[PDB]
Every structure is written in structure tokens, then in C-alpha cells.
Design a protein around this ligand. Structure first.
Ligand code: HEM
Ligand SMILES: CC(C)CCC[C@H](C)[C@@H]1CC[C@H]2[C@@H]3CCC4=CC(=O)CC[C@@]4(C)[C@@H]3CC[C@]21C
Ligand code: NA
Length: 395
């Protein structure tokens, strides 16, 4: 009953049998090797054990499979990593994210205002995807009318990450990066001459051990912040809201008592796990949870598998917004623990609260059909989500 899986095949993460493959992994081979020999930490304990040893499980070989390291902080180890983190993390603390609550809240109602009179919308296209793009776009200095453009580039950069990608879809990826690279490098120059307060200008004026960053790194550190912002939270928003709709009792709980929202957000994060994996590179041969790992090979941290680990969670296949503690690993753990985790939790809190309040009779358009997941091996979620609701007036 061993699953036949290629953990770099995007089709695996779009199939609804992925979690049954995870369950076999956790019970039979905690450090799993897929049909091509790729190692993966499948249990909560194995993921945590690897995260706690960056000296042995390094990021400096790149976070993706079949992909060399890039000049971004997530592909670095300390000290180099933490020097980069400290340059841009000031605005991402819990307190500094709270100062954005007012502006994030109005972006939410602006987006709901645009569909609330129609009685129908695509939850992904019209609500889930545009919120975080506007939030991180504002922090990156992206003009509001340039938001769909950056979202389109972002989609093209992550949608076709798969071991079985066609040469043409791969062309879409390198095209999107080239277009993103041209735009950003012109923005590099404008921020050099005329500095601003956006994160790009903070990056341009930064120095590490006395020297400024290269344009190659500046372009990639900006892209890391962009994709982290606009290709992650959107999937918890849509997938988590789907679970509230497929389990109406949870949706009813949240309206009857809005104080349950923070717990609902944590369960949406655990369930959806938008970042399906991150790679680590072994710096030496080791024995890890009974599996022999060789120096130089990559191992995937399977965050969704860890989030449904029965050794940690009671009844992990139940969607339960009252789960507490909910020590999920959607944001990872350790050195590279998500820098935007507080920002994503506030985006989720505010948009969900207004969906529940302003679209109170929300339901899926077709409860009997299943919504398609994105067949990619890095970030993945609902491709679309047609919903219907009783129309109301904008604010
Ligand atoms: C629900 C949404 C999100 C999820 C699931 C998520 C998940 C993750 C994960 C799994 C990692 C790697 C952690 C590890 O390997 O230990 C990560 C890192 C990161 N995330 Fe997020 N993230 C989310 C939202 C955001 C947002 C809104 C931003 C803001 C720009 C962001 C920026 C980053 C950055 C910059 C890193 C790399 C930080 C580092 O290497 O130290 N993420 N995220
Ligand atoms: C979810 C976040 C925390 C992590 C984001 C990691 C970065 C931004 C992502 C991860 C996978 C990367 C892509 C890897 C494949 C490709 C090869 C190139 O020739 C340069 C551009 C690239 C097109 C892409 C650069 C941006 C990458 C998309
Ligand atoms: Na590491």
C-alpha cells in the first residue's frame, strides 16, 4: 500500500489523496524516500528535528528541488541570513503589523464593496488573491493600478513549478521573471536617486558588513518578499473559507461568537498549509530518524504532513476552529520561521471577519463538485471558488 509519489510532481499536491500518502509516510517511513529517491521529513517530529539543526540541514543549497541557490535570504544560513532578515523585518513585528490594521481593514471592505451587490463572485479571484497583493504591494511601493500586473507575474512564477512542466509553460515562467526583472531594476535606479519609505528603497540603501547589496540580490530579495506576500495567504483565505462552508457548523460557530475568530484562523492555517514544502541540504552524512542521509542531498520538509500528524493533533482530519493548542507548522519553525507570519495572521483575521459579517449567508455555488487545486510542487491552493450570497450595499 506504499504510495507511488514524486514529491516534485505538481499533480501530487493537487490530488486529494495526498494526505493519505502522508499518513502512510508517518506510520511506515517517517523520513520518506519517493519513487525518485528524494528524501522527505513527513512527521512533525522529523520536521522539527531538522529545523532545529540548521548547521546540518542547510538552506544554502536552495529551498527548492532541481534548483540552485539564489541571492535571497531564504537561500542563506546565518550569519548571512540574519543580517538580511534584520534589514527588512522592522515593519513585520507583531506591534508594527497592528499599526497597519486600519489600512488593511479598508482594503478588505473596498474589495467586498466590489462584489457585494452582485450576489456572486470568485472567492479566489475577487477576494482571496487581491487582499495580500495590495497589502504587500503597498509595502513594496507598487502602484495600486499595477497590482494585477504584479499578481500575474507572481502567478506565472509559482504556478508551473513541477517536474513535468511543459517547455512552453516554463517559457511563461522565465518570461514573467524577465518582465519582473526589468521593472524592478528600473525601480532599483529610481530608489537610488530618489529614496522612499517602501521596502525596495530600504533594500537599496542597506549595507551588510560595510557594503551595499548587489542588484542581483536586491532583485531577488524583493521577489522573495513579493511571492511570500502574494502567493501564500491567498490560499489559506480561500481554502480555509471553503472548510468553513463545507462544515457549516464551524461557520455558524463563528457568527454566534466572533471571539472564536483567532482560533479559526489558526485552524485555517493548519489545514491549508499553502507552502507545501521547503528543502534542506545536508552538510554531512548523518543518521536521521533511522534513515541514512548523504551529504549534499536535499530533503523536503512536508509541512502539510506535519500539520495532520496524529502524534501531535487530536483528530487531525476534523476541521475544528476550537482546536487549542494548534501548534501547526504552516509558517515553518526555527531560523527561517516566516517573517510575514504576523502580517498574514492579520490579513486573515480582518478579511475573514468581514466575509463572515458582510456575506453572512455565503455558500459555494456547487457543493457537489470539488474545487480544483493548483498542480504545483511549492505553493498550492484552490484555483477558483465560485460562491453565492445575498446582495447587500457597499460601505
Ligand atoms: C499564510 C501565509 C503564509 C505562509 C503559509 C507562509 C509560510 C512560510 C514558510 C513555510 C516559510 C519558510 C519557513 C521555514 O522553512 O522554516 C516562510 C518564510 C518566509 N515568509 Fe512566509 N508565509 C506566509 C505569509 C507570508 C507573508 C505575508 C510574507 C510577507 C512578505 C512572508 C514572507 C516570508 C519571508 C520573507 C520568508 C523567508 C524568511 C526567512 O528566511 O527568514 N510570508 N513563509
Ligand atoms: C513562499 C516564499 C516564502 C518563498 C519564495 C521563494 C522565491 C521567491 C521563488 C521560489 C521558486 C523560484 C523560481 C525558481 C525557478 C526560476 C529559475 C530562473 O532562471 C530565475 C527565476 C526563477 C524563476 C524563480 C525565482 C523566484 C522563486 C519563485
Ligand atoms: Na537551515
Amino acid at each position: 500500500i506504499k504510495p507511488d509519489v514524486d514529491l516534485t510532481d505538481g499533480n501530487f499536491y493537487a490530488s486529494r489523496q495526498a494526505r493519505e500518502a502522508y499518513r502512510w509516510m508517518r506510520a511506515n517511513q517517517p523520513v520518506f524516500r519517493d519513487r525518485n529517491g528524494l528524501a522527505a521529513a513527513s512527521t512533525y517530529q522529523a520536521v522539527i528535528d531538522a529545523e532545529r539543526q540548521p548547521e546540518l540541514f542547510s538552506n544554502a543549497g536552495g529551498i527548492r528541488p532541481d534548483q540552485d541557490a539564489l541571492p535571497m535570504m531564504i537561500d542563506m544560513d546565518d550569519p548571512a541570513h540574519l543580517l538580511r532578515r534584520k534589514l527588512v523585518n522592522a515593519g513585520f513585528t507583531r506591534k508594527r503589523v497592528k499599526d497597519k490594521e486600519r489600512s488593511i481593514a479598508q482594503l478588505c471592505d473596498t474589495l467586498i464593496d466590489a462584489v457585494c451587490e452582485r450576489g456572486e463572485c470568485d472567492f479566489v479571484r475577487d477576494l482571496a488573491a487581491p487582499l495580500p497583493m495590495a497589502v504587500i504591494g503597498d509595502m513594496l511601493g507598487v502602484l495600486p493600478e499595477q497590482r494585477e500586473m504584479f499578481l500575474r507575474w507572481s502567478d506565472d512564477l509559482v504556478t508551473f513549478l513541477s517536474s513535468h512542466v511543459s517547455q512552453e509553460d516554463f517559457q511563461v515562467t522565465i518570461d514573467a521573471f524577465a518582465a519582473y526583472n526589468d521593472f524592478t531594476r528600473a525601480t532599483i535606479a529610481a530608489r537610488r536617486a530618489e529614496p522612499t519609505d517602501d521596502l525596495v528603497s530600504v533594500l537599496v540603501s542597506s549595507e551588510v558588513d560595510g557594503e551595499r547589496l548587489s542588484d542581483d540580490e536586491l532583485v531577488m530579495e524583493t521577489l522573495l518578499i513579493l511571492i511570500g506576500g502574494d502567493e501564500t495567504t491567498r490560499h489559506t483565505l480561500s481554502g480555509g473559507s471553503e472548510q468553513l462552508l463545507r462544515n457549516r457548523d464551524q461557520w455558524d460557530l463563528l457568527q454566534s461568537d466572533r471571539e472564536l475568530l483567532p482560533g479559526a484562523i489558526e485552524e485555517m492555517l493548519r489545514w491549508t498549509a499553502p507552502v507545501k514544502n521547503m528543502c534542506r541540504m545536508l552538510t554531512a552524512d548523518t543518521e536521521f530518524h533511522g534513515t541514512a542521509l548523504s551529504e549534499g542531498e536535499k530533503i523536503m520538509l512536508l509541512f502539510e504532513s506535519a500539520n495532520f500528524d496524529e502524534a501531535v493533533f487530536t483528530d487531525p482530519e476534523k476541521f475544528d476552529i476550537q482546536r487549542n493548542p494548534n501548534s501547526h507548522l504552516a509558517f515553518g519553525f526555527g531560523t527561517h520561521f516566516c517573517m510575514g507570519n504576523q502580517l498574514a495572521r492579520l490579513e486573515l483575521s480582518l478579511m475573514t471577519a468581514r466575509v463572515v459579517q458582510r456575506l453572512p449567508d455565503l455558500r459555494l455555488a456547487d457543493q457537489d463538485s470539488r474545487l480544483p487545486l493548483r498542480p504545483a510542487n511549492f505553493v498550492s491552493g484552490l484555483e477558483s471558488m465560485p460562491v453565492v450570497f445575498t446582495p447587500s450595499r457597499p460601505l
